[PDB]
């Protein structure tokens, strides 16, 4: 039994080809995993609180309070794009391919090992290690999804990239049900804001505990475990951003006079006056038909209220945004109209020699141009008396109730009849692959997280924990402290994923931006003499296309 090992170790990228533009991108990967024995034992419910910060006046949310159930188990999981792909391999996908389709996913675990630590006292101490055959490892994997769900990166504690370096899973946890309400506050607020907790509604409680649900293959080690392949169900994603904004929807007006000399300050003429132009329009009184005012088949994007926190069971939380900041060059900070900004560390950047610790941060803009730029928006009466007098219209400079930061733009919305937008572009390699789809019946039209969504059910996760041991002592069903033999165990892990894509084709006269090395990043790709690594972010949606 022990005298064999059944596994293989693969990180490869192989391009198999078919007829007529359909190309299977088949990527594999693997990692080495080390796993501490969980120090706790029983399932554990905890409520976290920090209030001096919500106590002091102001501080809308610098934090809230949550309650979770911490299992001893731990989660090895896929669903990053740094687990399988390489910024070397990533190139040939995004330059040649206009679309993706998802197919199939599978995992297996092979050649487990279990070790042991015996800590001497009178010795220095030195740590003895004797490989233990008869100890055991637990593997619990469900394809039913019944037990509750998370992906992981809302943080990116996910498996480390590169396949020479080990990586660790993370302890597994999920939200419980409480109630909280929090009243506003600011610097000038007097009295008390009345911040209170609020127990738990007993009507609704979920303790979900996998040992009450899903089987568990147990392993001493010669043995392997393999999950069969569970397919996906999805819709494709476009790799090609849409530049045309509400200006480019239509046929442009006809110039009646064409300019002359080469070199430019040279401006053509619309050739008619503003009064006599001919065309369709929507407006209160038109002797005016402009490049601006005119009927367009529909809008693009939506103006959304930004930084508005609606209250609920958890009270304060942020209301997300589905668009990019494209067209707005003057508002940055981090992600002004919203540009999801990843913060990770020590594991996929902030080059791998970093003394102490400190997070890593980059604002990821959109490469899609849909203008939501709030500045330069206002409203008129229906009379259209031009030039307009200050008393008959609005500006972003006008308060609400006598305030300043608010313009009017913080309270607005449209979205309704004519709007549309493009599915959120995938990001890399801190992003996410697939996402489970909501349980209710109205099925939001997208997610500001994942590119792809299983419309039926997504494949599950892989849970693992060391098997317990006792020496001699015990009490039955006791939350007192039972002694233990400190151990740990390593197991290799493999993964496979299947893609389908189509080659794009030129039909333009122009070349198109690609990713490539230069001297801007000269070496962001090549290791540092201590072994340094980064894998800087890279923006992929590179391909402009027609829209309407």
């Amino acid at each position, epitope marked *: 039994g022990v005298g064999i090992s059944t596994g293989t170790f693969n990180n490869q990228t192989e391009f198999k080809f078919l007829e007529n533009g359909w190309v299977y991108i088949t990527a594999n990967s693997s990692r080495l995993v080390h796993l501490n024995m969980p120090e706790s034992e029983n399932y554990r419910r905890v409520v976290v609180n920090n209030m001096d910060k919500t106590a002091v006046n102001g501080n809308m949310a610098l934090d809230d309070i949550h309650a979770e159930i911490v299992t001893p188990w731990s989660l090895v999981d896929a669903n990053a794009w740094g687990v399988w792909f390489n910024p070397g391999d990533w190139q040939l996908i995004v330059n040649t391919m206009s679309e993706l389709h998802l197919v199939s996913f599978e995992q297996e675990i092979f050649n487990v090992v279990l070790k042991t630590v015996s800590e001497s006292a009178t010795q220095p101490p030195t740590k003895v290690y004797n490989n233990d055959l008869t100890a055991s490892l637990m593997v619990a994997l469900d394809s039913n999804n019944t037990m509750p769900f998370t992906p992981a990166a809302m943080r990116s504690e996910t498996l480390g990239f590169y396949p020479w370096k080990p990586t660790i899973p993370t302890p597994w946890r999920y939200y419980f049900q409480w109630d909280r309400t929090l009243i506003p506050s600011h610097t000038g607020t007097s009295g008390t804001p009345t911040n209170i907790y609020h127990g738990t509604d007993p009507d609704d409680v979920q303790f979900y505990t996998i040992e009450n649900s899903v089987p568990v293959h147990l392993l001493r080690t010669g043995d392997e475990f393999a999950t069969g392949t569970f397919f996906f169900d999805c819709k494709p994603c476009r790799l090609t951003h849409t530049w045309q904004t509400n200006r480019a929807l239509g046929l442009p007006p006809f110039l009646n006079s064409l300019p002359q000399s080469e070199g430019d300050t040279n401006f053509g003429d619309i050739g008619v006056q503003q009064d006599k132009r001919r065309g369709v329009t929507q407006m209160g009184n038109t002797n005016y038909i402009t490049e601006a005012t005119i009927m367009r088949p529909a809008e693009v994007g939506y103006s959304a209220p930004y930084y508005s926190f609606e209250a609920s069971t958890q009270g304060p939380f942020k209301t997300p945004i589905a668009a990019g900041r494209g067209g707005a060059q003057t508002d940055e900070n981090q992600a002004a109209d919203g540009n999801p900004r990843y913060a990770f560390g020590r594991q996929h950047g902030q080059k791998t020699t970093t003394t102490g610790e400190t997070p890593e941060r980059f604002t990821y803009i959109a490469h899609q141009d849909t203008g939501r730029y709030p500045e330069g928006d206002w409203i008129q009466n229906i009379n259209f008396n031009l030039p307009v007098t200050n008393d008959n219209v609005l500006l972003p400079t006008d308060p609400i109730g006598g305030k300043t930061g608010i313009n009017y733009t913080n309270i607005f919305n449209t979205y309704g009849p004519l709007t549309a937008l493009n599915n959120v572009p995938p990001v890399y390699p801190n992003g996410q692959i697939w996402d489970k789809e909501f349980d209710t019946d109205l099925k939001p039209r997208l997610h500001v997280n994942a590119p792809f969504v299983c419309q039926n059910n997504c494949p599950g996760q892989l849970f693992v924990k060391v098997a317990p041991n006792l020496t001699n002592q015990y009490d039955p069903d006791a939350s007192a402290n039972m002694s233990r033999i400190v151990t740990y165990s390593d197991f290799w892990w493999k993964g496979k994923l299947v893609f389908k894509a189509k080659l794009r084709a030129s039909h333009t006269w122009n070349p198109i931006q690609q990713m490539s090395i*230069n001297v801007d990043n*000269q070496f962001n790709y090549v290791p540092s003499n201590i072994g340094g690594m980064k894998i*800087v972010y890279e923006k992929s949606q590179l391909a402009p296309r027609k829209l309407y």
Partner: nanobody
Amino acid sequence: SGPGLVQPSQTLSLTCTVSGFSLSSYHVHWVRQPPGKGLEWLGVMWNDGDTSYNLALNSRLSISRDTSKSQVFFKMSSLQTEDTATYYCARPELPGLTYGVWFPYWGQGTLVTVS
């Protein structure tokens, strides 16, 4: 850089335009006190570099726009000042190894950055 405390962001930029030989890569931001010190002379990023105290990292593209960054925060509680940033900018080192060495000219006298 600063101003002023304890570790705010950015405000080091000069000089445009024609900032020197683009050799991959170059200096000089002047550097430093002037009585010191300093600053073991930038590489190019993944991995080429770098400076002598952590979080001193530098980055920029030598193509146009020819610029610089950050720089940087870093640890300023020592009240030190180099507020410019002007070029020619001899041989960096890394390239170098003549042996070394030498540094012709500079530009744009005193800019002082507060503690």
